[PDB]
Amino acid sequence: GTILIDLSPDDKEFQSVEEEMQSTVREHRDGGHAGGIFNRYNILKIQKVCNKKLWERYTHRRKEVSEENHNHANERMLFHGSPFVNAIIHKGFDERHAYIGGMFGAGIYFAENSSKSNQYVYGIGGGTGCPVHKDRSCYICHRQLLFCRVTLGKSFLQFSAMAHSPPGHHSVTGRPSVNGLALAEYVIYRGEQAYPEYLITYQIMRPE
Numbered sequence: 001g002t003i004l005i006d007l008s009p010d011d012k013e014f015q016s017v018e019e020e021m022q023s024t025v026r027e028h029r030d031g032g033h034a035g036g037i038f039n040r041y042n043i044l045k046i047q048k049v050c051n052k053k054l055w056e057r058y059t060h061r062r063k064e065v066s067e068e069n070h071n072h073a074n075e076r077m078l079f080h081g082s083p084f085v086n087a088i089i090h091k092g093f094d095e096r097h098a099y100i101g102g103m104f105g106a107g108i109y110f111a112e113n114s115s116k117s118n119q120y121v122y123g124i125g126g127g128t129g130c131p132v133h134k135d136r137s138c139y140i141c142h143r144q145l146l147f148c149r150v151t152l153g154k155s156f157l158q159f160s161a162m163a164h165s166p167p168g169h170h171s172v173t174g175r176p177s178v179n180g181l182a183l184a185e186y187v188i189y190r191g192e193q194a195y196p197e198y199l200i201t202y203q204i205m206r207p208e
């Protein structure tokens with residue numbers, strides 16, 4: 001029941017989604033090892049993900065969290081990178097998309113920095129790079145990210161450098177406390193707390 005609606009670059013919706021990609025790029029402490037070396041992207045396509053059943057699954061859970069948290073879903077738009085982007089848009093988020101070895105435990109992880117999510121496009125640590133060239137820093141191959149609606153509800157705040165939420169909470173916020181440029185990262189423990197709104201196809205660009 002998933003259809004993908006192709007957006008025009010003339011559409012203000014495309015523009016604001018792209019602006020969110022580009023402006024949340026940062027340098028990484030691995031010097032580009034996982035995600036490649038780039039300051040910006042070449043956005044090839046942005047598609048809206050329409051799945052009624054997955055959307056209704058999302059809103060049902062959203063209303064539940066909201067009601068446990070003074071009518072406040074605490075909803076964000078966050079990036080997600082994964083080799084399983086394609087299963088996610090058709091079948092939705094579930095336990096097979098969880099990062100078992102993550103620093104905040106076995107859950108599904110999201111990023112405010114698009115470039116953080118980019119490090120996961122080819123696997124943990126960027127795996128072995130793109131399938132074609134085995135290059136983690138490939139400038140040729142097409143990459144895909146999700147820009148997702150995420151229900152955080154009451155988030156356990158964790159200062160720093162599948163399972164359950166900490167009791168009394170609906171998610172975990174990893175606050176950065178070493179790198180002053182890093183944006184927050186987030187973990188949900190139920191697939192229903194995220195909807196894969198936008199599929200963005202792109203290339204990282206070789207810096208000049």
Ligand SMILES: CC(C)(C)c1ccc(-c2nc3ccccc3c(=O)[nH]2)cc1
Nearest residue numbers: 080081082097099109110111117120185
């Ligand atoms: C274990 C698999 C391969 C399913 C997987 C693990 C972690 C991510 C993933 N982690 C992240 C961790 C922090 C911030 C953003 C992300 C992100 O955007 N993605 C994606 C897939």
Ligand SMILES: [Zn+2]
Nearest residue numbers: 130133138141
């Ligand atoms: Zn490649």
